[PDB]
Amino acid sequence: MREIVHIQGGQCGNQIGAKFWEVISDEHGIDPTGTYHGDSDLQLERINVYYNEATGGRYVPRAILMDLEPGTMDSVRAGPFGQLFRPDNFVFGQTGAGNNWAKGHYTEGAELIDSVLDVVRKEAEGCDCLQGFQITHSLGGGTGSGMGTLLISKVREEYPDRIMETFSVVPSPKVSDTVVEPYNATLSVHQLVENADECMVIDNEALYDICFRTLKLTTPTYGDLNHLVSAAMSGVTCCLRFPGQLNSDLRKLAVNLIPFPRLHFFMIGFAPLTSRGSQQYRALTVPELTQQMFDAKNMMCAADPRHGRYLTASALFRGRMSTKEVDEQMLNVQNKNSSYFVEWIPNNIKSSICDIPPKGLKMAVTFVGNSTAIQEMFKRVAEQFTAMFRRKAFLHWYTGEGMDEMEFTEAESNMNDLVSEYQQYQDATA
Amino acid sequence: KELDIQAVIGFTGKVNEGLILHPDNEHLIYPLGSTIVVRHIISRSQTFLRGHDNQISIITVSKTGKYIASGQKTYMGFQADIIIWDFETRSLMHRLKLHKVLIQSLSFCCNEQYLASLGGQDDKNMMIVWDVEQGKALYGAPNRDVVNQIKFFNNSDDKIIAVLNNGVQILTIDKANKKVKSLDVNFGNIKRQYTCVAIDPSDTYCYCGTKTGDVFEINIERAIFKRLGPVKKLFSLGIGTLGLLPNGDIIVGAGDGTVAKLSIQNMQVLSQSEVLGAVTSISFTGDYTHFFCGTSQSNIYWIDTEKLNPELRNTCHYERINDIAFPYNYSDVFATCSTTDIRVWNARNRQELLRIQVPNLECYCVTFMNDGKSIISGWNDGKIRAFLPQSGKLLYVISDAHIHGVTALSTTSDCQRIVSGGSEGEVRVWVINKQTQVMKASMKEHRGRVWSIQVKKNNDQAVSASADGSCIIWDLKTFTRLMCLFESTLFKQVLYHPEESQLLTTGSDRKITYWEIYDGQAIRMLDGSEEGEVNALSITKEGEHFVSGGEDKLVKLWGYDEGIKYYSGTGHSGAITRLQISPDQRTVVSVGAEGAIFIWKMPEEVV
Amino acid sequence: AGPIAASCYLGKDVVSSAHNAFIQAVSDLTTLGHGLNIDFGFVKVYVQDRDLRYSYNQNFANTLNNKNFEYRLRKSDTPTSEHWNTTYESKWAKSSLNSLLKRPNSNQVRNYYEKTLALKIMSLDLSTAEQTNYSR
Amino acid sequence: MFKNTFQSGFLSILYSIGSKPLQIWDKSIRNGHIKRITDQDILSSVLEIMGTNVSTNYITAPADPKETLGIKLPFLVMIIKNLKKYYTFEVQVLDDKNVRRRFRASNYQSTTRVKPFICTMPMRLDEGWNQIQFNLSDFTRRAYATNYIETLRVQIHANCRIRRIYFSDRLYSEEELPPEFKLFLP
Amino acid sequence: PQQGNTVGSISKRENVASQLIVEDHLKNILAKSTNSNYKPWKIPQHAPVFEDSQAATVVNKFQGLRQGTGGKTSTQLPVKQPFQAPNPICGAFKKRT
Amino acid sequence: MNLDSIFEWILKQPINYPGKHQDSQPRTNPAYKPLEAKAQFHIIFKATGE
Numbered sequence A: 001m002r003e004i005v006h007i008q009g010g011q012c013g014n015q016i017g018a019k020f021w022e023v024i025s026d027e028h029g030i031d032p033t034g035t036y037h038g039d040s041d042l043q044l045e046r047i048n049v050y051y052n053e054a055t056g057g058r059y060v061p062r063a064i065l066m067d068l069e070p071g072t073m074d075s076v077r078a079g080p081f082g083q084l085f086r087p088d089n090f091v092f093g094q095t096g097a098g099n100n101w102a103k104g105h106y107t108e109g110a111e112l113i114d115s116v117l118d119v120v121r122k123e124a125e126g127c128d129c130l131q132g133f134q135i136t137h138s139l140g141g142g143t144g145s146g147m148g149t150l151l152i153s154k155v156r157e158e159y160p161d162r163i164m165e166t167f168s169v170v171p172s173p174k175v176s177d178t179v180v181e182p183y184n185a186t187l188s189v190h191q192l193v194e195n196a197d198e199c200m201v202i203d204n205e206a207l208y209d210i211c212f213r214t215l216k217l218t219t220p221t222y223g224d225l226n227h228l229v230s231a232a233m234s235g236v237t238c239c240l241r242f243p244g245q246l247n248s249d250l251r252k253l254a255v256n257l258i259p260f261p262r263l264h265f266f267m268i269g270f271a272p273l274t275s276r277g278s279q280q281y282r283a284l285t286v287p288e289l290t291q292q293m294f295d296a297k298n299m300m301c302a303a304d305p306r307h308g309r310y311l312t313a314s315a316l317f318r319g320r321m322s323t324k325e326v327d328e329q330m331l332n333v334q335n336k337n338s339s340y341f342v343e344w345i346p347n348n349i350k351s352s353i354c355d356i357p358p359k360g361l362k363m364a365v366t367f368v369g370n371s372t373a374i375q376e377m378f379k380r381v382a383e384q385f386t387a388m389f390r391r392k393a394f395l396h397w398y399t400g401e402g403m404d405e406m407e408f409t410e411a412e413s414n415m416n417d418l419v420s421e422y423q424q425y426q427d428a429t430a
Numbered sequence B: 001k002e003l004d005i006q007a008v009i010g011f012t013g014k015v016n017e018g019l020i021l022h023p024d025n026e027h028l029i030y031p032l033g034s035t036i037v038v039r040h041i042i043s044r045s046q047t048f049l050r051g052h053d054n055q056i057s058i059i060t061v062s063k064t065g066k067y068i069a070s071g072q073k074t075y076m077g078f079q080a081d082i083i084i085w086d087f088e089t090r091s092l093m094h095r096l097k098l099h100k101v102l103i104q105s106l107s108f109c110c111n112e113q114y115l116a117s118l119g120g121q122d123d124k125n126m127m128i129v130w131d132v133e134q135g136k137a138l139y140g141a142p143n144r145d146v147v148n149q150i151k152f153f154n155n156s157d158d159k160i161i162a163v164l165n166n167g168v169q170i171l172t173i174d175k176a177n178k179k180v181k182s183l184d185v186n187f188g189n190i191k192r193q194y195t196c197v198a199i200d201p202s203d204t205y206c207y208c209g210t211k212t213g214d215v216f217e218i219n220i221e222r223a224i225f226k227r228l229g230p231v232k233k234l235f236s237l238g239i240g241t242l243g244l245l246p247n248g249d250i251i252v253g254a255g256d257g258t259v260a261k262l263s264i265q266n267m268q269v270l271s272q273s274e275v276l277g278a279v280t281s282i283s284f285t286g287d288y289t290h291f292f293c294g295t296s297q298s299n300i301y302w303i304d305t306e307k308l309n310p311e312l313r314n315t316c317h318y319e320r321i322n323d324i325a326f327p328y329n330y331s332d333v334f335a336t337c338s339t340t341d342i343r344v345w346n347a348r349n350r351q352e353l354l355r356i357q358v359p360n361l362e363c364y365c366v367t368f369m370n371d372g373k374s375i376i377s378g379w380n381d382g383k384i385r386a387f388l389p390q391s392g393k394l395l396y397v398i399s400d401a402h403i404h405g406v407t408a409l410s411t412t413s414d415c416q417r418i419v420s421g422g423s424e425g426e427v428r429v430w431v432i433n434k435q436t437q438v439m440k441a442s443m444k445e446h447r448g449r450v451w452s453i454q455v456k457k458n459n460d461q462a463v464s465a466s467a468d469g470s471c472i473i474w475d476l477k478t479f480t481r482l483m484c485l486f487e488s489t490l491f492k493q494v495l496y497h498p499e500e501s502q503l504l505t506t507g508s509d510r511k512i513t514y515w516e517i518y519d520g521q522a523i524r525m526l527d528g529s530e531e532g533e534v535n536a537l538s539i540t541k542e543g544e545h546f547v548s549g550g551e552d553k554l555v556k557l558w559g560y561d562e563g564i565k566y567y568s569g570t571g572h573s574g575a576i577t578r579l580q581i582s583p584d585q586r587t588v589v590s591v592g593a594e595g596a597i598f599i600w601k602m603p604e605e606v607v
Numbered sequence C: 001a002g003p004i005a006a007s008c009y010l011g012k013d014v015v016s017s018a019h020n021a022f023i024q025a026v027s028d029l030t031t032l033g034h035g036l037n038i039d040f041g042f043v044k045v046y047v048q049d050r051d052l053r054y055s056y057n058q059n060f061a062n063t064l065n066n067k068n069f070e071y072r073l074r075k076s077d078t079p080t081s082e083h084w085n086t087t088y089e090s091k092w093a094k095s096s097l098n099s100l101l102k103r104p105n106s107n108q109v110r111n112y113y114e115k116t117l118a119l120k121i122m123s124l125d126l127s128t129a130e131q132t133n134y135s136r
Numbered sequence D: 001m002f003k004n005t006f007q008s009g010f011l012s013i014l015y016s017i018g019s020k021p022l023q024i025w026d027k028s029i030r031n032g033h034i035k036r037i038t039d040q041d042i043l044s045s046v047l048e049i050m051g052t053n054v055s056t057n058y059i060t061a062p063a064d065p066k067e068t069l070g071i072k073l074p075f076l077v078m079i080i081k082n083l084k085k086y087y088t089f090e091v092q093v094l095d096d097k098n099v100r101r102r103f104r105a106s107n108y109q110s111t112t113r114v115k116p117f118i119c120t121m122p123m124r125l126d127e128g129w130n131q132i133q134f135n136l137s138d139f140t141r142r143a144y145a146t147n148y149i150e151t152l153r154v155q156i157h158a159n160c161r162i163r164r165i166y167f168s169d170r171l172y173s174e175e176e177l178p179p180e181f182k183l184f185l186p
Numbered sequence E: 001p002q003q004g005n006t007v008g009s010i011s012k013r014e015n016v017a018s019q020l021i022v023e024d025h026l027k028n029i030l031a032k033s034t035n036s037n038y039k040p041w042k043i044p045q046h047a048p049v050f051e052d053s054q055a056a057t058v059v060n061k062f063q064g065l066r067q068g069t070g071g072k073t074s075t076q077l078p079v080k081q082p083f084q085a086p087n088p089i090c091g092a093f094k095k096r097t
Numbered sequence F: 001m002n003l004d005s006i007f008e009w010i011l012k013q014p015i016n017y018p019g020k021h022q023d024s025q026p027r028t029n030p031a032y033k034p035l036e037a038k039a040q041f042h043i044i045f046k047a048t049g050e
């Protein structure tokens, strides 16, 4: 019950599913054959949330994979933990979008959307108690941000009361992979905030940097990154599939974290995490967790968490410990960071504890809070989008694909205004 | 004088491919906690080796029945020791020092003149080429990813195979130059983790093990792969290891519990078999039939190919035995506590009788009760459970007895009440009732966990064992009279000497301190090794002798009349934890801390 | 069969019965389709739905025309004084048969048979030692 | 099974949106086929049971014999898409007197005769998705003048696509019915 | 719609490796096809050692010449099984070429 | 058939062609061991052609 569907799209959303799914199976010890060989009774009590029952006693995840070009699809199955996916669910095209936002949202996707979209009802109707839809996609991939974003609008059009999860990775300005990174984001953002109830930002620059400063791993690999991507993701519902002192489903975290309908952006954090060298030296302490999960470098985005004021905080504690130890630890930091803590709403920090920690760890906590600091990011991307706009650069493709600059113009107008309005409350005082 | 051993009960399959039937058989090597023991099949005689510090990490035997080699894992600062051992001489030949913690495994070339070792996940997985005749550092080079094992080619020692974590690289070694060659196999649309190696005898093709459970095909001629594996079926935890039959048929045992064979043709299992536990070792005897199989749960099984009917030889305690007990005035059957489960074992012959197991809990101080009632234990959760001897079902549950779990339990002569040990400085008594179970313990105050509890014949008074020492004798009737024999150490097991107010006790310090009911000391034994602490003691029915086992590998039994020893124990590894005497007193049995069970014939001139 | 069961070291009786079981080409051929190719050596045998066709290996086709069957065709080209001169074993070894299967070690094979059955019976137990040798 | 339970407004015995739409239900099949497919007429998932010799294919409400699904709900109602072909349904009823009866409706029968054990009754099916409200209150009194107590069994035969089975318990309009019960027009 | 939909189905059938693929034509597919884009040109298994799997369970005793069932013609001796042809099925559902 | 698929047929339905060959058989000389049931159907015939 309280189940949500897994939807991974675009090139940046695929491997995470190739990795996120692996993690879950390890979380429930689900063997590569889809047959349960776990150790604890609690392991399976709520497996319907992410795993369904099939004939013969095997399990198949309830995820729908898609893309405009089959090559990326032709890779997930060859990877470890691919035998769980159902062969029928795959839907693929023949040409691709080529990092062209207009192609994935105006011409190509419109015809192919139904086939991939169609399977939504067959699944969404399949749920015993739908909780929401979680989307893992990147605004930096033209095929993704074009095809991926539209599905949200159609998806939302049928279940308005539902609450939706989106995990989008915006290419940080520090490192760029496709010269058209600015374009596809700006128009995507305009639609993105149009439907999404929740959202999470992630920058690769912040992603690998934590590896170089904290993890210090010798040779980073995307696979190492994916393990980083889900780890924080894995905590999203960890409290949703097992009991706890104060059960925390997906919705209530939504209720406690979005002060206004329009200002619904957060940053996250995952702990514990350290380099291989000191794997034994430190001592796992809640005070150790609280400082780190309040450590700025622990943030998943390049934006400095100390560069703004925290709208609110949410604590998802993994593992056991005394309840009182939860409350005192949180309050002290707010007092020691009052200048960093807004005064509109006292106790803007949410504390919940999960009784089933990650495998191989005793105490774990993922940080989630709405930080105004996001006002920098929307400035940089737009400035990158704005500055190159004046030269009419690369503009003829979307204009030649049925879309007009007015659609280009409208995006920033709803982009820059949201930038100020988010920062408008920053200078407000009681 | 040492103490005679009449049998050894114990086995560990943690180190892969531990079992191997010696070429021509009659010899087999199975790693104990830290020592190597070789046993004869036709005859029951066996030889012992004890020249090692830490536990074994890998064991393998060179072809043609020459000397053996292996490796182990020590602490990070120190370096693992190499395990070159001869054959037909039973004498240590060479010793080497290198590597940080542990090396994955060893395997010799076709000739007995080359040796190579691959370091653990530490040391960047250092691989070095060693000389069989004498110790030298020929040459070596590192590797970026972790290689979990290496096996040399049946022929043409110049070329070997190593199945690295992310890629299977064929390494080439040339004598002319010290360098080592590396070529990368290409697997487009492949991301599989691999575990085992199997080079075909022809040396052209070979096969390996995978975590998914599918066996790939790769010939040494070129890195390209050829096949997929058993279509439409997987073993649910990959491949533990692989072996090659004379016909080429591949016999595989899924660690999930399965024995399967894939023939060299479109691979459809002709026959299947699943054995309890997780397969760990696959070895072929002479004339190629009835291979030897040992699981990960320390199980040894015998099979017949072409119809896989598992047949059990014998298995052993999972690891780190907890305690021993004997039936009142009875020694035919003895039981013990394991890390998660309990078992019932026969004395005359070591064939298992029956068992009582708990899912994810560890127990302490398993004891038997008079009148067959019953097998009672308090578990990590603190609950107290009792089971019937005939079948593994519980009689009554006493839950939430201790916050940090039970620690002690014994038997009252009338057993109308129970006596236990509390870790949080508590001792709780229970006047059991058949209709319901209730407690009336005073809930006393104590600094440390109670490590033992004793009941005298008249069962009024009682002596309490402690970690902070605090040897507080409880009146057990009024729940008062807190007077404790003094010592500023961490005591251990304590028992009552027969028909005597003298209490033979041991503490943290290396000394068998004597204390009476009037703070009198007969003598300070001074039984202590360099860093060995005696952890178990007892007294015979007649106050003539007492057998003691310290933290040392030795079994140290002394006479109570005077501090003069008679015989001792040898051949033990780990930290022995308890020593009891059977009611017949014909033998004294103690188990190894690592999961080793040994029985010793007590000296005749003590009855 | 006669000198065939001795050829592959199999019982005389089984071979004959084994011959009949493979013989029923009709039963597997009476049904529709199921074309076959039975070669087992020099010549190949093929079958479509019902038609028949076959070819003969040239190399074997060549030697029958090797101008050397003249001594084969007549019955009395040999000296005829050797019939009791030669033991059937002498020509037996040189025949194309008895060499199809390699000669394994006769007394060595007797060896492993004395052992594998040795461990099975005496491995029922592995505890009793009566030989301590703790130090070595 | 539905005993000592609160039954006031509705009891969705068979419903077409769930992980295991028929868990309590038991099925026996001889020559037809059982499968669920999205309906063209209405964008929803509905169960379908297709076969021939309708007397052979069917699905039973209670899992197995020796238990009764007794229900104090007075009304019965049930939804189907007409396939312009054979269809049948029958239910079991317990009377005030300690006797067990059953009332059958037939798509392919023209004559009905009140008779002590069974009273077969013809049916007429309307084109397109149709909802039929079974009284189950007047019929019991009309058959033998013996009131209703509880429904003992519910059976559905083959060659009919069913979207939901529930007990209305009272004449309710479409407006009264909740969104789940109400069948929104395509 | 119509075309371009199965193209998403060929790979799906091609999806399973199983040491095989479905190129949409494997055997008995019409007479033949053009050898290249234009018309063709004028001038263009592993088996085991069967003698190895040996004596898994059956003992190695042999009966030998010493035999004879004459005189022991009791009613309990087994009777040789006669032959029975297999059920014919024809090829109603087989491929047609 | 391929002269190799067929033998997968004869050894399949034992009642169709029941006999001594549906099981592995002992060997005359004590040295050799009985082969796998299907195998004896391969050793016997291969020689016959020779």
Ligand SMILES: Nc1nc2c(ncn2[C@@H]2O[C@H](COP(=O)(O)OP(=O)(O)O)[C@@H](O)[C@H]2O)c(=O)[nH]1
Binding pocket: A010, A011, A012, A015, A099, A138, A140, A141, A142, A143, A144, A145, A171, A177, A178, A204, A222, A223, A225, A226, A229
């Ligand atoms: N963690 C991780 N990120 C990746 C990987 N491959 C690509 N990305 C991210 O995806 C972004 C590019 O997305 P793109 O392929 O253009 O999306 P698409 O055009 O919709 O398919 C880059 O900024 C990368 O940071 C990977 O293997 N691991």
